[PDB]
Amino acid sequence: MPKHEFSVDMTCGGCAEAVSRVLNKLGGVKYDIDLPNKKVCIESEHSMDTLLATLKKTGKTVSYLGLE
């Protein structure tokens, strides 16, 4: 499917807010958000690639994990 975990840095909550403000702008995405483990579980018709170059605009320590 197009289920896409990214590990990120949100060592302060505002990074999750920022990430949301990023990804939301994409539109079709939805994304669950873990703060303590600093992760975004994105599930999106828009591919991991499309996600990457969007999520990248946060410029956190974003690292993409496997595709489900």
Q: How far apart are the C-alpha atoms of 43 and 57, rounded to whole Å?
A: 18
Q: Which of residues 17 and 68 has its CB atom nearest to Cu ion in the complex? A: 17
Beta strands in the chain (DSSP E): 3-7, 30-34, 39-43, 63-67
- DSSP class of residue 9 equals -
Q: Which of residues 19 and 48 has its CB atom nearest to Cu ion in the complex? A: 19
Q: Which residues bind Cu ion (CB under 5 A)?
A: 12, 14-15
Report the nearest approach of Cu ion to the CB of residue 50 (Å).
24
Report the nearest approach of Cu ion to the CB of residue 11 (Å).
6
